[PDB]
């Protein structure tokens, strides 16, 4: 239950910057957007397949560009 205690002299701005950062580092919003509505285990597996393939092609691409240069 992500909390950010605001000090007496601490500013609201950085206070909610800390809140935003540790929310993002708990990944609450991404989890909620993931659980909005159901997905077949098949399609979870397939999207992970494709994401990893995209990552591999992009990395090979990046290294090719680095050596091409």
């Amino acid at each position: 239950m992500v909390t950010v205690t605001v000090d007496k002299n601490e500013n609201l701005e950085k206070a909610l910057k800390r809140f935003k950062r540790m929310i993002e580092k708990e990944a609450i919003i991404r989890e909620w957007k993931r659980r909005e509505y159901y997905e077949k285990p098949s399609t979870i597996r397939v999207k992970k397949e494709k994401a990893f393939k995209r990552k591999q092609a992009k990395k090979v691409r990046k290294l090719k560009q680095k050596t091409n240069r």
Partner: protein, 117 residues
């Protein structure tokens, strides 16, 4: 005419609406406000500006309950939740904590099905 001093502000910020409730430390509600009640309707109800207006109106409702000391609770993925907290600050009522109560299940209650089958 009552004095409480301490209090809580709950803010639900979903994709469709924003609801701001001002309540005791015990949780008993003092007042509330909503984007739908603030005259907006349609996609306006979820813009950050509407969230700001809704929150500040909710607090203006409770100017005279003798409170300057609130705990902020947030749930929902709405865009302008930061705007809700920012407006609570802008009104001058000081905050002592900011929290989230967004419910994260441990995998129960199979959710709705996808859109565009």
């Amino acid at each position: 005419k009552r004095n409480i001093g301490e209090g809580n502000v709950y803010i639900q910020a979903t994709f469709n609406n924003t609801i701001v409730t001002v309540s005791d430390i015990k949780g008993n509600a003092l007042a509330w406000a909503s984007a739908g009640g603030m005259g907006f309707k349609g996609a306006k109800k979820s813009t950050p500006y509407a969230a700001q207006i809704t929150a500040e109106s909710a607090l203006n409702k409770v100017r005279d309950f003798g409170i300057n000391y609130v705990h902020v609770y947030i749930k929902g993925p709405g865009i302008g939740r930061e705007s809700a907290i920012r407006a609570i600050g802008s009104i001058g009522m000081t905050v002592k904590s900011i929290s989230d109560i967004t419910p994260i299940p441990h995998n129960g209650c199979r959710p709705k099905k996808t859109r565009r089958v």
